[PDB]
Coordinates of C-alpha atoms and ligand atoms in Angstrom, one line a residue:
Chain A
X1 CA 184.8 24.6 -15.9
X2 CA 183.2 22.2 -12.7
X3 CA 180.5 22.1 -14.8
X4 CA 179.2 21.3 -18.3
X5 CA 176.3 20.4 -20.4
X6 CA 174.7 20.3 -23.6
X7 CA 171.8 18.9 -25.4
X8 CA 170.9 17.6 -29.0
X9 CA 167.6 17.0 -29.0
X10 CA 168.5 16.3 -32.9
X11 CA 171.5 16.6 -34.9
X12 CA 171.1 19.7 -37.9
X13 CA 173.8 19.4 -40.5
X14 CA 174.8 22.6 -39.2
X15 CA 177.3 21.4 -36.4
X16 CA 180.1 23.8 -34.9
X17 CA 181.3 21.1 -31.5
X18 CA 181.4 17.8 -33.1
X19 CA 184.8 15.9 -34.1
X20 CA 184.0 13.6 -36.4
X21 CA 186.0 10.5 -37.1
X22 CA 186.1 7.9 -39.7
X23 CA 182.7 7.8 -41.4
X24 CA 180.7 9.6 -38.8
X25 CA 178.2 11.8 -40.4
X26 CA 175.0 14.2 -40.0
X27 CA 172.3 12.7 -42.6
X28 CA 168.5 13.8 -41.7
X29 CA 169.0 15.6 -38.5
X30 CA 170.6 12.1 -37.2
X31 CA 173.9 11.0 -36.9
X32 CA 174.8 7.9 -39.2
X33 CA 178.0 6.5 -37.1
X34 CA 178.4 4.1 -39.8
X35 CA 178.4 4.5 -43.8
X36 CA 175.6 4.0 -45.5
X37 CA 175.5 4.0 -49.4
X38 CA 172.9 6.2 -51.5
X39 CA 170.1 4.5 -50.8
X40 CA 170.3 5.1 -46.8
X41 CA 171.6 0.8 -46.5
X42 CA 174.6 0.0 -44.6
X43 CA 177.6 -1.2 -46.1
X44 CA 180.3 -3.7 -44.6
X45 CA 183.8 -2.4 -43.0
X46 CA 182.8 0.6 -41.6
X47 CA 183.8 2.6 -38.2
X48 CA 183.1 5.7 -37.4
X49 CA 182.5 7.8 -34.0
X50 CA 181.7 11.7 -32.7
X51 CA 183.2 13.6 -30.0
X52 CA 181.9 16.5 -28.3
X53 CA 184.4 19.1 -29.0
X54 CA 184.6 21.0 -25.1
X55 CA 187.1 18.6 -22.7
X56 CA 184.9 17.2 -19.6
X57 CA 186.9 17.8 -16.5
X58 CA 186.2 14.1 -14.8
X59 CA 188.4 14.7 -12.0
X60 CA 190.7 16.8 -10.0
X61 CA 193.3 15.7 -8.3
X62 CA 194.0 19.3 -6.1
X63 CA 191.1 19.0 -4.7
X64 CA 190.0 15.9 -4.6
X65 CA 186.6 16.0 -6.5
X66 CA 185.2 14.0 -8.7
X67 CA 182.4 14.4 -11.3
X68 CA 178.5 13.6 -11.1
X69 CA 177.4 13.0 -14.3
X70 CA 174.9 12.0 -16.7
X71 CA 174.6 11.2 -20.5
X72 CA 171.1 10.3 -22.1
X73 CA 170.5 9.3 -25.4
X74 CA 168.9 7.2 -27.9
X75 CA 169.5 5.2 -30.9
X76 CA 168.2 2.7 -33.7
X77 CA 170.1 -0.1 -35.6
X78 CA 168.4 -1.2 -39.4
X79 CA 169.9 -4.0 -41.2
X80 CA 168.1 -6.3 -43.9
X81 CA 170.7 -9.0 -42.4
X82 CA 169.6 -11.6 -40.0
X83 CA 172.7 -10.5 -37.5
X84 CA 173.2 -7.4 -38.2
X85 CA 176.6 -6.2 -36.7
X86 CA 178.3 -4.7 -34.5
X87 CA 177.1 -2.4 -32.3
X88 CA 176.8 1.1 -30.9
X89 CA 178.9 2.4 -27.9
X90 CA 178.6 6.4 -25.6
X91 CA 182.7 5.8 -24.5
X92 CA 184.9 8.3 -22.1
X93 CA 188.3 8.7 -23.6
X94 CA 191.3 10.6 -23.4
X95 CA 191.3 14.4 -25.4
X96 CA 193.1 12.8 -28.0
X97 CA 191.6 9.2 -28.8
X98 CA 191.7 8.3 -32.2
X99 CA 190.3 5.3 -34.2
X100 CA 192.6 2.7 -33.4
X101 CA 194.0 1.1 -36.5
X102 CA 192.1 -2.2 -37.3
X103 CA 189.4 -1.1 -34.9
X104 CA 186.7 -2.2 -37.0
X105 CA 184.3 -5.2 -36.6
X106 CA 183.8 -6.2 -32.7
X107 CA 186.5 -3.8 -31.3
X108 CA 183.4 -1.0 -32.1
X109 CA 185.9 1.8 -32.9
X110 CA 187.4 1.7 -29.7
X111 CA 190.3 -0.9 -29.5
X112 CA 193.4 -2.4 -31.3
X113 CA 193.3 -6.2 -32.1
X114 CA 196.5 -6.5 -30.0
X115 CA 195.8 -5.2 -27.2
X116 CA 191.6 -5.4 -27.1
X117 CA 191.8 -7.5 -23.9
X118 CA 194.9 -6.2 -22.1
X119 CA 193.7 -3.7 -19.1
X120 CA 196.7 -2.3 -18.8
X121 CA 197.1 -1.1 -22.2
X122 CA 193.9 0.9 -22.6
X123 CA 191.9 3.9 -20.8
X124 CA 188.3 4.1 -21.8
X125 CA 184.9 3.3 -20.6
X126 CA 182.3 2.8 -22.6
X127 CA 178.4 1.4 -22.5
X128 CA 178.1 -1.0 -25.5
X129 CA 175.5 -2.2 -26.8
X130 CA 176.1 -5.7 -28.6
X131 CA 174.4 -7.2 -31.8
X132 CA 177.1 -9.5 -32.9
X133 CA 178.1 -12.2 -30.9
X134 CA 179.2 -15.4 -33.0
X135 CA 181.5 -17.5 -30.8
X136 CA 183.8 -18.1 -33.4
X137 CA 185.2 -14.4 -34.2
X138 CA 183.6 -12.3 -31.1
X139 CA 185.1 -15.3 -28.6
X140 CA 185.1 -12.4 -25.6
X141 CA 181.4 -12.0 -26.3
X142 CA 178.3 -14.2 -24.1
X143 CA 176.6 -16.2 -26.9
X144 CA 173.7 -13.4 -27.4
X145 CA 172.6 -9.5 -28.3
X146 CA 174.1 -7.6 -24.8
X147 CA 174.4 -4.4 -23.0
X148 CA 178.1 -4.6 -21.6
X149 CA 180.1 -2.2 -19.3
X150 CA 184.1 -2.0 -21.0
X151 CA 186.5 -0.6 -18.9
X152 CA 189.8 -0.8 -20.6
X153 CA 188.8 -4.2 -22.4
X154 CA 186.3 -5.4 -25.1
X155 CA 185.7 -8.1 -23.1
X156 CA 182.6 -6.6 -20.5
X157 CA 183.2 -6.5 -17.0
X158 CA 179.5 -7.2 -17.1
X159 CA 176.9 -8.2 -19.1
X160 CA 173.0 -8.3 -19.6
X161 CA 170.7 -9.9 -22.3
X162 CA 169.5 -7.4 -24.9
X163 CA 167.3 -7.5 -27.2
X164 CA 167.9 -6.3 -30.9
X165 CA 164.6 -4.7 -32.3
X166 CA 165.1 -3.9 -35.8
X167 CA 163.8 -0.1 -36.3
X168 CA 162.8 0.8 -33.0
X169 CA 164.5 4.0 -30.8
X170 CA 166.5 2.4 -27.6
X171 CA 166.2 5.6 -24.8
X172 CA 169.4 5.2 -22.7
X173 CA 170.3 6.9 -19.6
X174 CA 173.8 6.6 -17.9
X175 CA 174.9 7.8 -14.7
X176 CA 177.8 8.1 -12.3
X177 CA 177.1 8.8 -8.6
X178 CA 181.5 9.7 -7.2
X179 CA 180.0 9.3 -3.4
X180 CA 179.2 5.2 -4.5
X181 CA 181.0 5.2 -7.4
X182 CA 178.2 3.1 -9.1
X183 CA 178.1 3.4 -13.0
X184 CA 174.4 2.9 -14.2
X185 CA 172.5 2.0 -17.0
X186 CA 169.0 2.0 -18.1
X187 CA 167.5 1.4 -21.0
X188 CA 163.7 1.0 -22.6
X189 CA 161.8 0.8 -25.9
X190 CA 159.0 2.6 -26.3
X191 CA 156.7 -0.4 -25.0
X192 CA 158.1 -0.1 -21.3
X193 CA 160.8 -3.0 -21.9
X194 CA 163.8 -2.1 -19.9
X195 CA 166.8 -3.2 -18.9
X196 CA 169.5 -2.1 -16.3
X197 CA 173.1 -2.8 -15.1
X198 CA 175.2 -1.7 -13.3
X199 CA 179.2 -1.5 -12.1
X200 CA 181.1 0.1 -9.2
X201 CA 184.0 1.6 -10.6
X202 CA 186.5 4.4 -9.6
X203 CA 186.9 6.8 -12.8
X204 CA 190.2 8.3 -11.5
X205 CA 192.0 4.8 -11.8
X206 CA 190.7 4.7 -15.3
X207 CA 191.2 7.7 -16.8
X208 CA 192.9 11.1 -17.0
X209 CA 191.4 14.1 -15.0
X210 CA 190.3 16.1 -18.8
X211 CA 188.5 13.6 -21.0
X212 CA 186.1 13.8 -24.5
X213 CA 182.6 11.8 -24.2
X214 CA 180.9 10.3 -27.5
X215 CA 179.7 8.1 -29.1
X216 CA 181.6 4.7 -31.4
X217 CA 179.9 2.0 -34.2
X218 CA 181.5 -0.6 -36.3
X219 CA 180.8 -3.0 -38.9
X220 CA 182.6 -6.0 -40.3
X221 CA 181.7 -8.3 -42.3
X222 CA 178.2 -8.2 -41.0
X223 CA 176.3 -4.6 -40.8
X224 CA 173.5 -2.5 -39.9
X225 CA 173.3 1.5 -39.7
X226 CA 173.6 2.9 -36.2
X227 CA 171.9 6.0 -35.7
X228 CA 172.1 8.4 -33.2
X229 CA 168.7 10.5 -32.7
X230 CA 169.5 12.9 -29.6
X231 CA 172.0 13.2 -26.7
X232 CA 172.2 15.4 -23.5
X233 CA 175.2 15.5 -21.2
X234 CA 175.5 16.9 -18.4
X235 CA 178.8 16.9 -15.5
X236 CA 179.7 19.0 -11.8
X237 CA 182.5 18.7 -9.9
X238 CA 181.7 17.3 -6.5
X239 CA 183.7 16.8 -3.1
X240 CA 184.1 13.5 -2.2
Chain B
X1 CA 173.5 22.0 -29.4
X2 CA 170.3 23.6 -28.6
X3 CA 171.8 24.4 -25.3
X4 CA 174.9 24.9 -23.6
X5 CA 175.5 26.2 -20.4
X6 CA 179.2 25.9 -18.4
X7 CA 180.2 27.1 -15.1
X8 CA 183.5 28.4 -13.5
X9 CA 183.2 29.1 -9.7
X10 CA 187.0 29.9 -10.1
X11 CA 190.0 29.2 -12.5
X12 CA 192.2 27.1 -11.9
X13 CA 195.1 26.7 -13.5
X14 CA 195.0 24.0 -16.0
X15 CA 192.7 25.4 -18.0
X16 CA 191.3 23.0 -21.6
X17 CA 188.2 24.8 -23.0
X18 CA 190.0 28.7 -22.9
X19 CA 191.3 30.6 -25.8
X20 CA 193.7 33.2 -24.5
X21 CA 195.0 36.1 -26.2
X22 CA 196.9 39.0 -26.1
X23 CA 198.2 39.3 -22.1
X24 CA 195.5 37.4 -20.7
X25 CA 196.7 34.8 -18.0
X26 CA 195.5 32.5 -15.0
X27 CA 197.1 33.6 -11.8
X28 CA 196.0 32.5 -8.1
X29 CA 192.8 31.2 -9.3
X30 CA 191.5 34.0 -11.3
X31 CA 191.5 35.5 -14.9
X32 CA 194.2 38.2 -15.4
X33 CA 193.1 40.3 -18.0
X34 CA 195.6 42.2 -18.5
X35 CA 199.1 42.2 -18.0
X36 CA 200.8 42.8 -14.1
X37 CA 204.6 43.0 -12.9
X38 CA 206.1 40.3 -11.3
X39 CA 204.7 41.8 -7.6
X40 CA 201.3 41.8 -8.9
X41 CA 201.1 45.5 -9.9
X42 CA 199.2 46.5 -13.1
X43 CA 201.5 48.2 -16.2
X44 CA 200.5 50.2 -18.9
X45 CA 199.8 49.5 -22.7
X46 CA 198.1 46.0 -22.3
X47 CA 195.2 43.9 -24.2
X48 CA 194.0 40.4 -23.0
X49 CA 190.9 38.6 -23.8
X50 CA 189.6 34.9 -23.3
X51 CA 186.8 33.3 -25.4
X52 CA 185.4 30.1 -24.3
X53 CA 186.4 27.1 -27.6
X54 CA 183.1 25.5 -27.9
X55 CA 180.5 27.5 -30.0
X56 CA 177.4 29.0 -29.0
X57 CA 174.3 28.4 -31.3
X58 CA 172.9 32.0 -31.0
X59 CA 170.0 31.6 -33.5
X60 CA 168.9 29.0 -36.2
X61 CA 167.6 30.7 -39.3
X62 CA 165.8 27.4 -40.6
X63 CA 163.5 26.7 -37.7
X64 CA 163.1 30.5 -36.3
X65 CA 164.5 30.2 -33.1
X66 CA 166.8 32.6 -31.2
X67 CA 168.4 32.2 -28.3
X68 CA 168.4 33.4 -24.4
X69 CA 170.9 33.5 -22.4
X70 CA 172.2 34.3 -19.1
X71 CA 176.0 35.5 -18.1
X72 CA 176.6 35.6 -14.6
X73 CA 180.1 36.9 -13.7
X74 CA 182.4 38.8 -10.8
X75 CA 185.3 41.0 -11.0
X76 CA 187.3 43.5 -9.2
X77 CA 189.4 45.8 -10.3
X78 CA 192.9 47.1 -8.1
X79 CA 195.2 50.1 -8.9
X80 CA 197.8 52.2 -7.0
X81 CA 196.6 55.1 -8.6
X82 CA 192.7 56.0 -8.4
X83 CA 192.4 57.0 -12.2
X84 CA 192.3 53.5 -13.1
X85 CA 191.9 52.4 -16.4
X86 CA 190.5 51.4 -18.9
X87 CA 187.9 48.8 -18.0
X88 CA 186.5 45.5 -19.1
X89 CA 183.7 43.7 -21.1
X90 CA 181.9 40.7 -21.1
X91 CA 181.7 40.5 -25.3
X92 CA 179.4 38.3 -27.8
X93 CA 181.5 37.7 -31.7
X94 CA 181.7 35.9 -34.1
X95 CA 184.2 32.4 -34.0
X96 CA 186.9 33.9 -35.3
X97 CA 187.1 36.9 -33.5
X98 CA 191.0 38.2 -32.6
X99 CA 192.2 41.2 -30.6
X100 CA 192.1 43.8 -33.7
X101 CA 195.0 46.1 -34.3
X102 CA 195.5 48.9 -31.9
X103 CA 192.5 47.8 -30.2
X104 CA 193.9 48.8 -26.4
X105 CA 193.5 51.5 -24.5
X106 CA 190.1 53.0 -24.5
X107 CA 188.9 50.9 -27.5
X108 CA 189.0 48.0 -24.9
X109 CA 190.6 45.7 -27.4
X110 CA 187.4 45.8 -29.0
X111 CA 187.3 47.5 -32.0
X112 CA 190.0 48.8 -34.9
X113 CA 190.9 52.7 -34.3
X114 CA 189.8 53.4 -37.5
X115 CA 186.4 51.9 -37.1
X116 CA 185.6 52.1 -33.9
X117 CA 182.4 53.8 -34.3
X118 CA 181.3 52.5 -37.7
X119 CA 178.4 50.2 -37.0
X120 CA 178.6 48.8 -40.4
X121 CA 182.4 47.8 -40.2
X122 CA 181.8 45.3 -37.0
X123 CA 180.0 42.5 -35.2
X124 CA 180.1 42.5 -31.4
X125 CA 177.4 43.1 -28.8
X126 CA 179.3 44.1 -25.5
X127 CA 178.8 45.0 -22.1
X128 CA 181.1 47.1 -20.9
X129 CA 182.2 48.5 -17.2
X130 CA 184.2 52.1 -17.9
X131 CA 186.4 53.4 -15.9
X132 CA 188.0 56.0 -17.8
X133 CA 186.3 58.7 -19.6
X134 CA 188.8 61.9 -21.0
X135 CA 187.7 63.6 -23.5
X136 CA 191.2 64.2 -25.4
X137 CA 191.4 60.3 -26.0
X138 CA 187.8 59.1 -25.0
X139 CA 185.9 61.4 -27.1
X140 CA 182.3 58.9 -27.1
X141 CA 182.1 58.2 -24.0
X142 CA 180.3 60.2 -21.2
X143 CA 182.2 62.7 -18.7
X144 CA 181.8 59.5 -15.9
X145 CA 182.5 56.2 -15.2
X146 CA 179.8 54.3 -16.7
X147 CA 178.2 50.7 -17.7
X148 CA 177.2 51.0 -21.5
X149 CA 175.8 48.2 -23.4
X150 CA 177.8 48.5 -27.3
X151 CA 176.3 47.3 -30.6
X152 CA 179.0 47.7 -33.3
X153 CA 180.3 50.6 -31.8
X154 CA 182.8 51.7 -28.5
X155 CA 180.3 54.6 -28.1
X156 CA 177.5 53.0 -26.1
X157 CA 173.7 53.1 -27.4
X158 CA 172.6 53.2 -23.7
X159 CA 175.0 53.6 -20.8
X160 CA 174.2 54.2 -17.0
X161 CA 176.4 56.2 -14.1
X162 CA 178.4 53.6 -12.0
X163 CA 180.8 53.9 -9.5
X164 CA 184.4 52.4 -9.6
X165 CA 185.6 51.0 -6.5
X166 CA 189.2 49.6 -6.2
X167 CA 189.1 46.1 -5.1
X168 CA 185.6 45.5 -4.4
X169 CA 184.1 42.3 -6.3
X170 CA 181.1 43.6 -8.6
X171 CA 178.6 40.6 -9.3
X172 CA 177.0 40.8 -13.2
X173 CA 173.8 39.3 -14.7
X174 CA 173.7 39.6 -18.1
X175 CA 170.4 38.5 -19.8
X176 CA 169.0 38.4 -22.7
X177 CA 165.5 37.0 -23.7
X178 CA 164.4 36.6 -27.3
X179 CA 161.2 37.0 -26.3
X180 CA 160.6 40.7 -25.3
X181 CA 164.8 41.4 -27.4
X182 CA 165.1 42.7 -24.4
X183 CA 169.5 42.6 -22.9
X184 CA 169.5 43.3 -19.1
X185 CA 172.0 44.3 -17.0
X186 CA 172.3 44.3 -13.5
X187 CA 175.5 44.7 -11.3
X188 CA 175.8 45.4 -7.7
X189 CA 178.3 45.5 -5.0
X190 CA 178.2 43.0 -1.7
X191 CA 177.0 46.1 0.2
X192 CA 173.9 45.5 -2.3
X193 CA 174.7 49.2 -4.5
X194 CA 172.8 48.0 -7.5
X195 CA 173.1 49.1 -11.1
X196 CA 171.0 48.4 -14.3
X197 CA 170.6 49.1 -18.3
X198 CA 168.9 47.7 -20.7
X199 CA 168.4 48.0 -24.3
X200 CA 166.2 46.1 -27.0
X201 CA 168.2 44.4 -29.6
X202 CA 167.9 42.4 -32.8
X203 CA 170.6 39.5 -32.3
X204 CA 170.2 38.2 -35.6
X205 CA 170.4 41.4 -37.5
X206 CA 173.5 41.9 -36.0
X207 CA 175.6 39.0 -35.4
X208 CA 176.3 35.4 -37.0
X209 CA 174.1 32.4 -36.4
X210 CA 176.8 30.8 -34.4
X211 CA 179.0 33.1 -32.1
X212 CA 181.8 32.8 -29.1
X213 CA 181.4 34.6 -25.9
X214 CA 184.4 35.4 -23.2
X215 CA 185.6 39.0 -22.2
X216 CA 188.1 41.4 -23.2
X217 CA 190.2 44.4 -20.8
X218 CA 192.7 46.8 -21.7
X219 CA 195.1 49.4 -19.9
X220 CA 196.2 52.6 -22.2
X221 CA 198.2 54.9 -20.4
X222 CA 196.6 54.8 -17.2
X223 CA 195.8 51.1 -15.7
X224 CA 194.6 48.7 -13.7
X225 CA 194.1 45.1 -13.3
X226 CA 191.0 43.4 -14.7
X227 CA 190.7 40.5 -12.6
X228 CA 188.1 37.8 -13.6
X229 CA 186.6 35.5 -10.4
X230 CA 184.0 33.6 -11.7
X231 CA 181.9 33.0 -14.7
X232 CA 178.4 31.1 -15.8
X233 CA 176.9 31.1 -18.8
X234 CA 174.0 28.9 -20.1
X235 CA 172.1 29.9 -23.6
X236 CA 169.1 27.6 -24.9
X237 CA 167.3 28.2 -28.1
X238 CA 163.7 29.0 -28.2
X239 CA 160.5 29.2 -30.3
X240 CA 159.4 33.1 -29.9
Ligands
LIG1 C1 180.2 -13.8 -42.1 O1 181.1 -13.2 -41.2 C2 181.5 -13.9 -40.0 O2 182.4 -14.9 -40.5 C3 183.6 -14.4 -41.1 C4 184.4 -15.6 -41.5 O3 184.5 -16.6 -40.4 C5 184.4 -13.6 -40.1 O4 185.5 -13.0 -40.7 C6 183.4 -12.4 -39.6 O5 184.1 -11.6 -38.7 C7 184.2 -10.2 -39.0 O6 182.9 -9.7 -39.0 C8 182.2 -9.7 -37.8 C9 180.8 -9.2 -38.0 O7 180.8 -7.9 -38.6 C10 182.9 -8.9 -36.7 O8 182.3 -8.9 -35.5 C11 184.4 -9.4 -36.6 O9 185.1 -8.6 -35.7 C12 185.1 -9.5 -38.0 O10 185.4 -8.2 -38.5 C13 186.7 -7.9 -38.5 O11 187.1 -7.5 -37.1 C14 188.5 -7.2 -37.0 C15 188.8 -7.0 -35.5 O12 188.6 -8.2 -34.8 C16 188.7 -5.9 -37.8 O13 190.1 -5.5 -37.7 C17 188.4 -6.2 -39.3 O14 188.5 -4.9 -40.0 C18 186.9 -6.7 -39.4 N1 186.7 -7.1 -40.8 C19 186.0 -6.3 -41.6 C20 185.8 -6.9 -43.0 O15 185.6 -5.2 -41.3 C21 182.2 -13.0 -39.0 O16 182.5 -13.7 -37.8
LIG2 C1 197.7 60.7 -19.4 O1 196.9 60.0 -20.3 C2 195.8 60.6 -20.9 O2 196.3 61.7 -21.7 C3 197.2 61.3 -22.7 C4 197.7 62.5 -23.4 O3 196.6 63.2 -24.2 C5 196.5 60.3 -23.7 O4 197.4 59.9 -24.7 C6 195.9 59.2 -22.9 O5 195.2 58.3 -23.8 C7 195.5 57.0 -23.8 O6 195.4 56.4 -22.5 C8 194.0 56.3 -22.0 C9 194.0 55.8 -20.6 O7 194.6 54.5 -20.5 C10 193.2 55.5 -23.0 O8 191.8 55.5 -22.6 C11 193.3 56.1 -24.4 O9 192.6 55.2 -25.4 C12 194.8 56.2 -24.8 O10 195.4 54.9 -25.0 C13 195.7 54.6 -26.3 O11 194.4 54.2 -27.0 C14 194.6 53.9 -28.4 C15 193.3 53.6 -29.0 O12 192.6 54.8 -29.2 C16 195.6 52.7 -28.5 O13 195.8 52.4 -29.9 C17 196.9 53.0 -27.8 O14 197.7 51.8 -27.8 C18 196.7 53.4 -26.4 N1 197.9 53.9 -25.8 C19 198.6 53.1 -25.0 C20 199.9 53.7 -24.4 O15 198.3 52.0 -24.7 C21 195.0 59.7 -21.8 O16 193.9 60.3 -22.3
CA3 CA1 180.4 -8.4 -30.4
CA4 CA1 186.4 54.8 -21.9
MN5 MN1 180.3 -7.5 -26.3
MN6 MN1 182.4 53.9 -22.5

């Protein structure tokens, strides 16, 4: 199809179009990315992301179109830790992505230790959102909590101070306009705070025409739960 | 989701999010029901249907809600002879659904010969467009070509005279609101020939919380092709 969408304004166990992966799982009409233990408190070495089941067609190559789309969502990270790690990440991958082996910890889910910072080996965007940033195992990271665009790399292509608040909903909206090929983001808590970025990329160097669209969270050695409350997506084919 | 909508101006070729089965192909940018000869000519004894993969949530028996939803779809239907046959159908089913055995012909790879008309032995809401009606074979059915609406049975609960014409695209709104239970039809012709049925119907009394949608065709004895243009489909659930 030129176009799709969906919406989840919450998640019901009841789920028919979700691939889950590693730990990913529906617990109070939320998705816990991450393991938690019995109690609801996250646990260390954890990775686990959701997929939407339908393929996304990003691009066609016949007839030179290329999609509009749009992915809102929000989220909220828990820890009793002081640095609670590692993050939370909406990526655009291949059909068949997998968790890459050894994934866990700073690579979010998303990328091998080998080949984390080698362009040439990867095709995925994602929108991260960073907790964990300690210079001495994250050395790719800025030295604080960030929002980072990744285009085929854990290390951002860009960058923006964040700021971790313990509980609280994050509302994200990300969009892609093909005719400037601008990849935005904007983000608030409920108190007005926002933040934006964004990054002029073109999708059809990056990645195949089909893709899958979701969502990635790790842990390491330091944790936190990463929950995802709701998620609308929404993509057309458009001539450029 | 809550909703879902998806939208195919035409079909292209590489196809990700179709299930095919039986004879049911892609050719020049449109859905080929049912089988044709290497000329493009329509043969005899042939079933094809396409479901779309991801889910539809239909109705939610924890919080209420039902579902409304809209179909919007074209066709056109070609044939040397002018006793086409036998027709297609825009169909609602549950997941799993397959083409049942010696389901073609009149039964419009629908329903089972031996249960054709048993409302207890199936699970399908359809909307079909009939184009042949003898009573040796065709026994339920109406001495004309007809649009019927079909509830667990090939012999319509509410059908309306229509008018076949070879290779002329007929544009279909399907709709259903949960509201009134109210399933509307309306077809018409570019000329603007309009046709309409409706019927009120219990969706949760007769099909599964979570269902797949697509379309089925078949050619008995007589034939024709059952050419598929274009489709939309958006469903949203609702508090009633
Ligand atoms: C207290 O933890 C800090 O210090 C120790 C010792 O120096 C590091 O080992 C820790 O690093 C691990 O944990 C952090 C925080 O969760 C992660 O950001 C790191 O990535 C790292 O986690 C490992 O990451 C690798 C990939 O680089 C994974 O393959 C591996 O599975 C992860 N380990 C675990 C136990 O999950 C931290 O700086
Ligand atoms: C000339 O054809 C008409 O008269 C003969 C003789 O009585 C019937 O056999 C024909 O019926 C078959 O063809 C029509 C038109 O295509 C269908 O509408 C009928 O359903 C029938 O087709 C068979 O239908 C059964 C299901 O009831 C299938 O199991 C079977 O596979 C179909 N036959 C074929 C060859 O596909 C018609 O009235
Ligand atoms: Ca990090
Ligand atoms: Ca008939
Ligand atoms: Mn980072
Ligand atoms: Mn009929």
């Amino acid at each position: 199809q030129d176009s799709l969408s969906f919406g989840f304004p919450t998640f019901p166990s009841d789920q028919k179009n979700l691939i889950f992966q590693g730990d990913a799982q529906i617990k109070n009409n939320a998705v816990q990315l991450t393991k938690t233990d019995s109690n609801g408190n996250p646990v260390a070495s954890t990775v686990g992301r959701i997929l939407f089941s339908a393929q996304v067609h990003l691009w066609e190559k016949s007839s030179s179109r290329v999609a509009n789309f749009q992915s809102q969502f929000s989220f909220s990270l828990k820890s009793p830790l002081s640095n609670g790690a590692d993050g939370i990440a909406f990526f655009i991958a291949p059909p068949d992505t997998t968790i890459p082996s050894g994934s866990g910890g700073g690579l979010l889910g998303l990328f091998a230790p080998g080949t984390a910072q080698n362009t040439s080996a990867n095709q995925v965007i994602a929108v991260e959102f960073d907790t964990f940033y300690a210079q001495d195992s994250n050395t790719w990271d800025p030295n604080y909590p960030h929002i980072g665009i990744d285009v085929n790399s854990i290390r951002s292509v860009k960058t923006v101070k964040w700021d971790r608040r313990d509980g609280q909903s994050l509302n994200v909206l990300v969009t892609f306009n093909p005719s400037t090929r601008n990849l935005d983001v904007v983000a608030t808590y409920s108190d007005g705070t926002r933040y934006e970025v964004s990054y002029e990329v073109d999708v059809r160097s990056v990645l195949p025409e089909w893709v899958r669209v979701g969502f990635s969270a790790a842990s390491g050695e330091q944790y936190q739960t990463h929950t995802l409350e709701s998620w609308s997506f929404t993509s057309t084919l458009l001539y450029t």
